[PDB]
């Protein structure tokens, strides 16, 4: 038979390489946001005058 | 052919009905002598 | 009288006529920082400071509008959203605000008055005169003005006269 | 040259002057019970007191703000939001507040007359100015100043110039 490369990869380490992998961009996508949100909010707070 | 001319037509004839929208909602607001554009606006039709 | 001469000391600081190749076609002004100027009159803006300065265009309100400079922005008009009914002031005179229209006692407003702001009775700018018509015994004008929201608003009676 | 006594008398026991090798840079005001210094000045403050600070800084708002001992909170100036428009007295006499902008006439507004408050009729810091820019024959202010939700807003015009 032919070795395929990521023929091994046993869906435990699947799973071991989306959390730590794609969990990471799940925290850099809301800390994104919540900075959005934070700089929306301080502009809208100096709408006042 | 004639599936490359109806689709540049209406590509072209959108795009100038759009940049027409665009220049009546933001023309009231850049004549002010504050201009003064509203938020909302400014996030939709990318003003100032 | 009195009220025409506070007008014009005004008007001799910040109302700018145009040069046409010997006469003057219309009048620029400069209000709130952005100088005005309608579209059918063609010449020169009489300062080369305002002169330079490229204008952008708005054909619906008839007006070309360009930036003032930044030493030119404590030197300019204010402008008024709220008018009540009554007496404003003008430089041929006065003039009639009633339900909404810009009225004058007829034999004056022809060619070459173009631009001139409509005062208040406090020295700010109401309207800028555009043309009008001889409705009768009592001419109407045709001006933009501005809201309570900040929306530029043209008025213009029927069959008016590009002054 | 009645409002000026009173903001030299106010400002005789609560303004500080930074001097960098004698020469004045800038001004610590102590307001509502907090001391306040703005960035860009260099030196220290005349004050033994409040030289012996950890000022925390804030750089956004060109201010390093501190806190003032418990004996010293009575000292202080009274400060508000409320502002109407019409005249303020700051250290050179009058300043306008139209449209929420402080302006003084032009001429005054160098090098060092930086963090000076700006007083009301009623004794009362509306605005602490940090810098601004000369239009030409009035100078607008870029100050810091508060509201009713009591938010601390600054307020800066283009192209202003650090004092």
Same mark, same amino acid.
């Given at each position: 038979?032919?070795?395929? $490369?990521?023929?091994?990869?046993?869906?435990?380490?699947?799973?071991?390489?989306?959390?730590?992998?794609?969990?990471?961009?799940?925290?850099?996508?809301?800390?994104?946001?919540?900075?959005?949100?934070?700089?929306?909010?301080?502009?809208?707070?100096?709408? /006042?005058? | 052919?004639?599936?490359?001319?109806?689709?540049?037509?209406?590509?072209?004839?959108?795009?100038?009905? $759009?940049?027409?929208?665009?220049? %009546?909602?933001?023309?009231?607001?850049?004549?002010?002598?504050?201009?003064?554009?509203? $938020?909302?606006?400014?996030?939709?039709?990318?003003?100032? | 009288?009195?009220?025409?001469?506070?007008?014009?000391?005004?008007?001799? &600081?910040?109302? $700018?006529?145009?040069?046409?190749?010997?006469?003057?076609?219309? =009048?620029?002004?400069?209000?709130?920082?952005?100088?005005?100027?309608?579209? /059918?009159?063609?010449?020169?803006?009489?300062? &080369?400071?305002? %002169?330079?300065?490229?204008?952008?265009?708005?054909?619906?309100?008839?007006? #070309?509008?360009? &930036?003032?400079?930044?030493?030119?922005?404590? &030197?300019?008009?204010? =402008?008024?959203?709220?008018?009540?009914?009554? =007496? =404003?002031?003008? /430089? /041929?005179?006065?003039?009639?605000? #009633?339900?909404?229209?810009?009225?004058?006692?007829?034999?004056?407003? %022809?060619?070459?008055?173009?631009?001139?702001?409509?005062?208040?009775?406090?020295?700010?700018?109401?309207?800028?005169?555009?043309?009008?018509?001889? @409705?009768?015994?009592?001419?109407?004008?045709?001006?933009?003005?501005?809201? #309570?929201?900040?929306?530029?608003?043209?008025?213009?009676? @029927?069959?008016? #006269?590009?002054?």
């Amino acid at each position: 038979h032919a070795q395929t $490369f990521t023929a091994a990869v046993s869906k435990t380490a699947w799973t071991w390489l989306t959390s730590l992998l794609g969990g990471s961009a799940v925290i850099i996508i809301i800390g994104l946001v919540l900075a959005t949100i934070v700089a929306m909010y301080v502009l809208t707070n100096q709408k /006042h005058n | 052919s004639i599936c490359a001319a109806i689709a540049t037509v209406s590509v072209a004839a959108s795009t100038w009905l $759009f940049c027409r929208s665009r220049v %009546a909602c933001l023309t009231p607001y850049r004549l002010t002598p504050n201009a003064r554009i509203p $938020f909302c606006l400014a996030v939709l039709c990318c003003a100032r | 009288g009195k009220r025409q001469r506070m007008v014009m000391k005004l008007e001799s &600081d910040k109302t $700018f006529p145009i040069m046409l190749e010997g006469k003057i076609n219309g =009048y620029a002004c400069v209000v709130g920082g952005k100088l005005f100027r309608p579209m /059918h009159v063609e010449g020169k803006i009489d300062n &080369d400071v305002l %002169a330079a300065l490229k204008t952008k265009k708005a054909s619906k309100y008839d007006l #070309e509008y360009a &930036d003032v400079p930044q030493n030119m922005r404590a &030197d300019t008009f204010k =402008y008024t959203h709220e008018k009540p009914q009554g =007496y =404003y002031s003008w /430089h /041929h005179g006065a003039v009639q605000y #009633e339900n909404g229209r810009f009225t004058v006692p007829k034999g004056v407003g %022809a060619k070459g008055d173009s631009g001139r702001p409509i005062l208040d009775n406090q020295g700010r700018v109401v309207a800028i005169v555009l043309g009008g018509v001889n @409705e009768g015994s009592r001419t109407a004008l045709s001006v933009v003005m501005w809201n #309570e929201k900040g929306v530029t608003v043209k008025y213009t009676p @029927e069959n008016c #006269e590009q002054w």
